[PDB]
């Protein structure tokens, strides 16, 4: 799919993902949720080739849920991101690689810290205060570089995110039909239903 | 070299006469008599074979010429001018008609093409 | 195609097979590849039939106009005209021509003009697809100042082998003899040369 953004503020991680699903000529859907809850305090957004994106995301979800049941324990965001990276690094030298880029937003309950990980389809992982995939970063990073502070509130993060989306809507040729925004914090994952 | 005569050699005189055309008509007047008669089921054209010498084979000099299978021509005046006009008339019947319509031109239109060639020698440089 | 020209005591003889192929189909089995560009200047053609015919026709025209002005051209002059056409138009031609002629002053001469349009004066020359198979035989058997009968045998035996191994060559062996006495055409049929 197209635009996926992430921003780590003081006490939460915010993931914004576009709603459009376009199959060549027509926009087939304008309410698509490009995300999966891997565990109660870990969310993964995704974008890439059709079919592979959801297939990969659900495969990861199943594996993390399996771990959660086996050990009666939630893996840290760092541990989950390392598992995901290895799967993609394994995938890139396969017969047919997963063409999927992901952002992993999680709240580490042990350290009481939000964490954002950016991983591309090659298995290139980086921990960031804010991140994106595709062309999204080209339009938004100059705004994030300017306004971002590590001590921002969730409300300030959402306001900076709105400015990013407005810039995308202005200068991007494609109509991505707005974004679904989700917040990951100590209380878990919730969706901002008005954005 | 180059043809540096890019101007008309036939021009209007004060009286409105085109001298060179009048003089060409005078040359025609000196020429041997030729005639044409139209019948209901045919046309005849005729002239005298004025042999320049008795040693000359006058059969080799054709005053009456086939232009197309259904068109013939005869002249009075300068023989060499006629001979080249016949060559041009035969060719123009093909290039400007037969190669376009797949048939020989009607008499009036071939005449029109020959007339155009003669008109141009009256105005061209 | 198998073509050759061989100088000998009394002049020069041109030899050729008669097979013209389009792929594996023999389009003409009785082709005449020995072509006259002047009374006693002939040539053997190999490569594109369209090209070598076009070239030969132009040369014949050039030598005809030369003769009208300056008298009989030399074999060297004819070769030069061939070369001029072949070299200057090398990008658009596929022609391998052997030029052979008889002067009274120079006697028998042979010039070969390969693909590039270079000229090479030789005692004898071989060309065409079939020539590859007789480089060994011709080199071993050629002598200078052979008789007419020896040269006919040399060419007959050589082209026989070229025809035997080359599928692109075959049919009859045609020959043209160029001497002071005049121009003589010879032909040799399969039943004759195959048993050699």
């Amino acid at each position: 799919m197209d635009i996926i953004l992430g921003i780590r503020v003081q006490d939460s991680v915010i993931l914004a993902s576009s709603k459009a699903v376009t199959r060549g000529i027509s926009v087939l859907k304008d309410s698509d949720d490009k995300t999966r809850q891997l565990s109660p305090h870990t969310l993964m957004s995704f974008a890439g080739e059709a079919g592979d994106t959801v297939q990969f995301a659900e495969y990861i979800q199943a594996n993390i849920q399996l771990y959660s049941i086996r050990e009666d324990y939630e893996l840290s965001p760092q541990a989950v991101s390392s598992f995901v990276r290895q799967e993609l690094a394994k995938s890139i030298r396969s017969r047919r690689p997963y063409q999927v880029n992901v952002l992993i937003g999680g709240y580490d309950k042990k350290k009481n810290k939000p964490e954002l990980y950016q991983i591309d389809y090659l298995g290139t992982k980086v921990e960031l205060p804010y991140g994106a995939h595709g062309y999204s970063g080209f339009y938004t990073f100059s705004l994030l570089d300017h306004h971002y502070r590590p001590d921002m509130t969730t409300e300030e993060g959402l306001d900076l995110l709105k400015l990013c989306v407005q810039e995308l809507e202005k200068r991007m040729p494609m109509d991505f039909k707005g974004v679904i925004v989700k917040i990951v914090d100590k209380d878990g994952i919730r969706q901002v239903d008005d954005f | 070299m180059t043809d540096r005569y890019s101007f008309s050699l036939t021009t209007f005189s004060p009286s409105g006469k085109l001298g060179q055309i009048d003089y060409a008509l005078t040359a025609v007047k000196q020429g041997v008599t030729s005639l044409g008669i139209k019948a209901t089921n045919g046309v005849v054209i005729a002239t005298e074979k004025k042999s320049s010498s008795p040693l000359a084979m006058s059969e080799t000099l054709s005053k009456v010429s086939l232009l197309t299978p259904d068109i013939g021509a005869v002249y009075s005046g300068m023989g060499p001018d006629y001979r080249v006009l016949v060559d041009k008339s035969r060719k123009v019947a093909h290039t400007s008609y037969k190669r376009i319509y797949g048939e020989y031109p009607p008499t009036k239109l071939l005449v029109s093409e020959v007339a155009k060639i003669m008109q141009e020698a009256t105005q061209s440089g | 195609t198998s073509i050759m020209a061989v100088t000998f005591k009394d002049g020069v003889i041109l030899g050729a097979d008669s097979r013209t192929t389009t792929g594996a189909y023999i389009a003409n089995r009785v082709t005449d590849k020995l072509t006259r560009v002047h009374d006693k200047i002939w040539c053997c053609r190999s490569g594109s039939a369209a090209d070598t015919q076009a070239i030969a026709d132009i040369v014949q025209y050039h030598l005809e106009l030369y003769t009208s002005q300056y008298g009989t051209p030399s074999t060297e002059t004819a070769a030069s005209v061939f070369k001029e056409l072949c070299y200057e138009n090398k990008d658009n031609l596929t022609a391998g021509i052997i030029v052979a002629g008889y002067d009274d002053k120079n006697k028998g001469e042979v010039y070969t003009i390969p693909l590039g349009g270079s000229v090479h004066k030789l005692p004898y020359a071989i060309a065409g697809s079939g020539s590859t198979f007789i480089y060994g035989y011709c080199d071993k058997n050629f002598r200078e100042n052979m008789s007419k009968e020896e040269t006919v045998d040399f060419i007959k035996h050589s082209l026989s082998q070229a025809i035997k191994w080359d599928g692109s060559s075959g049919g009859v062996i045609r020959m043209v003899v160029l001497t002071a006495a005049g121009v003589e055409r010879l032909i040799f049929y399969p039943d004759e040369y195959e048993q050699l």
């Binding site: - | 376009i100 319509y101 797949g102 048939e103 009607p106 239109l109 029109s112 | -």
Partner: protein
Amino acid sequence: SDPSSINGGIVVAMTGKDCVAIACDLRLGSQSLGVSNKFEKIFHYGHVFLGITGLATDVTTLNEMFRYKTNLYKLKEERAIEPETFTQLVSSSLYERRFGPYFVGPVVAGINSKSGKPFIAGFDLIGCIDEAKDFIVSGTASDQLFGMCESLYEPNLEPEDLFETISQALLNAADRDALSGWGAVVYIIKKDEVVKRYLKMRQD
């Protein structure tokens, strides 16, 4: 990509007893997209009729070109051009673009005004004349038209019988071609009257 099947369309011509018929569909398209249902492909210059299939810009261009040429012909000849003569003109005009051709399939139909003889002719894009006694077909459904005409046609049909034959040949051929249809016209041509009929057909 193939210029002769971008716009689509068909023409068919038939001879009958002292009459000729020429017919065409009305579709103009951009490949799959239908653009116009009023794009007539039959034109006439005096009593000579010309149908043209193929690339629509060339159809229009050639019509304008032959109107141009037949108008000058008439001024100089002092008579209307005949079908046999016009056929040669179409052939000449197409071949003069031998290495940059108009992507068309012209069809000539008419009756010689002096002999009264019915005449039809067809051409490839480059000018080769097909002068058939029976019928000529052209367009993206030419295979279908060949099949229809070969079975439906019989010689010496009366004008009103010929109408039914050529109409059914066109209609059923067009219904087996994605790029033809959207209406149809049939000309019934006699020595000094011509009747033009628009046919009712499926609009998909």
